[PDB]
A = this chain, B = another copy of it.
């Protein structure tokens, strides 16, 4: 498992093993983020396990990860959905293609990522991997957005940025 190093524009230039890649000095690399809703249209919010190297125990959007060499983003989303949440989904759709971001977690670990965002529908029940997810909630995107809007700090900075982007937010609410 690797992350794909990106140059100034997003051209891959190499790889690092995923664990060695996330440090206090994390270099720019490829990523994705996805927002999952159920058939009923509830938003799935997850809490990252205490063993995640970056933002452990943080409430965030449904699923995020790092596409591997030669892997489509949509495939990356599907893979991590199965891996973290043991869940099957509809074909992921673009919600925030240009999302890119850098931040530092309370322990000083950095994530530095070009991160296209997607939305999709689960088509199966969840089967949680507790090495990745320590908790989750099915809720209403409206309340979730109220929450991000009221107390952003209660949530991952990445989740907050995606939901604060006008386009992404409008797309998530129409997805719903």
Interface residues of A (CB under 8 A from B): 45, 47, 50, 56-59, 106-107, 134-135, 137, 139, 143-144, 146-151, 153-155
Contacts and interface: CB of A to CB of B under 8 A. Distances in A.
A134 to B, nearest CB: 4
B59 A154 contact: yes
Given A56-B57, A57-B50, A150 B155 contact: no
B56 A50 contact: yes
Contacts of A134: 106-107
Contact of A147 (B45, B47, B56, B154): B154
Nearest to A143: B150
A144 B135 contact: no
A146 B153 contact: no
The 9 closest A-B pairs by CB, nearest first: A57-B57, A147-B151, A146-B150, A147-B150, A106-B134, A137-B153, A106-B135, A154-B154, A143-B150
Contacts of A151: 45, 137, 139, 143-144, 146-148, 154
A26 to B, nearest CB: 19
Nearest to A154: B154
A38 to B, nearest CB: 16
Contacts of A58: 57
Contacts of A57: 50, 56-58
Query: Could you say which of A45, A106, A135 has the most chain B C-beta atoms within 10 Å of its C-beta?
Result: A106
A45 to B, nearest CB: 7
Query: Could you say which of A107, A149, A151, A155 has the most chain B C-beta atoms within 10 Å of its C-beta?
Result: A151
Nearest to A59: B154
